[PDB]
Amino acid sequence: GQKVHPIGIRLGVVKKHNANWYASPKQYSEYLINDIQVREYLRKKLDSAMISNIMIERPTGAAKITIATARPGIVIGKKGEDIERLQKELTKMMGVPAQVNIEEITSPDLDARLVADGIGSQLERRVMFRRAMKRAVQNSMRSGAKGIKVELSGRLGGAEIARTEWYREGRVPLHTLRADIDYASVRAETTYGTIGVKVWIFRGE
Template structure:
């Protein structure tokens, strides 16, 4: 079952944390909305932020709720595109989220990702962008694998599925290098999903990435001098063609 479970949800409370951090009752009260209402509101906030910042390489959006205040933390590889000139884009985003949240105070934090090669979601979106620009999917996958291993990842696996290269029949192909343990709960496994829209149809991209334990220090450069990532083994990525 390890291959059918989302690696992030599989490791919640162990090595991964929730991306929505708040508490709500099942039914709405005079003091707080119901769980379903807050969940729907979170989905609207994430969808809007992702759409407005689609050029800013946004990896994930963490939402924290307090009494009458919402903190939205945007993890991005291009923080300059989030702020805009003289923080105008950030202020406009805050005003829109203020309306979506029903008048709650909005606090937007931006965390910069220093090494986008070590973020599974950004790697998946990069491959999707290349496929939409008519780059050969095999070339995009191999290039991303080599860049991730060179950056210090323990292993990576990438799978593309759909009408690859405009083929008449849909199929899926995957490449992998290094170790990507799906059953080991203590392993730091990242997971990213993206979709590439092509004239032949939609191609789905999934990325599994196994990272060292001290990756947070390297990814966000909180302790760049002390944190060292061991280099992965270089070599030609192994190809695996999955059965239909």
């Protein structure tokens, strides 16, 4: 526990906030609470389709939610009937129409959250942690990442003593502020406890 968040330290130099609205000092708190509610609802509902970058920007009441997923087809549904239900469920627990327009991740091996959640799903499927970690490294490296680091922390393989393991390939220079490093941290709820999964994908400058 001695490292800054890669996204947060880069929030203004090369990255952008995944929430772009403006409020007044009194309105801001309720905007933020509603935003966090929508985010947690979305991440629990669309847990099948591999969404990674839900972005909330609300211009004057009406909002424009933008989810980026690697599998837009399943979350949109047939002719677009799941997306309408999602639209109205968002609108119900926000103020007025939440236009959710859905992007597409054309390289799911370069997004850190998709890699981390894949490793997590494999871990909850009682797959060897070393093999899952190495598979993710290989997949990202041959998909074209300039660097990938993946850290697995916890009771790995049912071990009584938790340990931290990791693999790195490429550069992933955390201290460089202009590095374009995607980062994700998820948890796999195994049968022996929680295993934390951290993924750094360094893509350029």
